[PDB]
């Protein structure tokens, strides 16, 4: 019998939730994120995203949602999650210690593109290279973190940080509710 | 500006969260959803998952995860995540009695999801579904179904998904160390 076990974990994700919606920074970040991304757009830039884990399918479903939405009469995509083309983790052991995110920025960023870096403890090496190539690139940064932020911390332009300290799967859960608010608060946006 | 519009979505997900854990059908449900998954494993059988758009995400999180773990030291992939027939003709060509499809579908109206489901009858797998709203045209045809009670849009359905299946990959460790 897991029924504590159950309501346990569904407990604490309602107490992150809590924490999450209590502190105005927070909610204030995901605006400024979604006006970012929006303003980028309009002036025909595109967004990278990128994740490990569970977070590359939050990285997916934020760059088909937005390219879903926005492809018709504009050239290019609007945004792109980024993926391992040159199979490079498949030597297995992935840590996330790798140049997939770097590489795929500095191959297609452009000045006045977007990078979204999500990393549930702040301390992914792959998305922070991306980072250092998106600035070599000129192109603004968001990320979506945990607990204190990692070695990230303070290299976004935009962070948007969930405020829980043990494992990621609380962190993530946020995060995908952070990614569609993202999405309704571009839509806003995007008709303006 | 928006600044309203984002607590009052976080609010009705913290509304969909309490109406989800406060039913103890729902609870139920998620124990004897990783029950038939453990066991199914222990028995030599694997389980297949598929979903659409967000979902499908969501199917292959779980199908990753699950063989990431349990794959060392066993024939073959205890999951696998599928990519209207797209997810039945897999089905066909790859189910044997004993394997179990996992069919996620916030609406329970996905026409894919439903004729995997019929396929997976007719190989003779268990069928275990992440359903939202009142189960839609799906609801009645799993073994175990677990339904979020919430009847708007499929947002707010797909986040207590992800967070039952990062409950279900907890609860089958339990099961399988057993």
Known sequence: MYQDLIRNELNEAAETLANFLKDDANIHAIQRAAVLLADSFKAGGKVLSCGNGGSHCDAMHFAEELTGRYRENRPGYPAIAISDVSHIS???????????????????????????????????????????????????????????????????????????????????????????????????????
Not at 98 to 121: K, P
Not at 148 to 168: C, L, Q, S, W
């Open 90 to 192: 498949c030597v297995g052991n992935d840590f996330g210690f790798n140049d997939i995110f770097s590489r795929y920025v500095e191959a297609v960023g452009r000045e006045g593109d977007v990078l979204l870096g999500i990393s549930t403890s702040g301390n992914s090496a792959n998305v922070i290279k991306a980072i250092a190539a998106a600035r070599e690139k000129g192109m603004k940064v968001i990320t979506l973190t945990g607990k204190d932020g990692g070695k990230m911390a303070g290299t976004a332009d935009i962070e948007i940080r969930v405020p829980h300290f043990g494992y990621a799967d609380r962190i993530q859960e946020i995060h995908i509710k952070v990614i569609h608010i993202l999405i309704q608060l571009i839509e806003k946006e995007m008709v303006k």
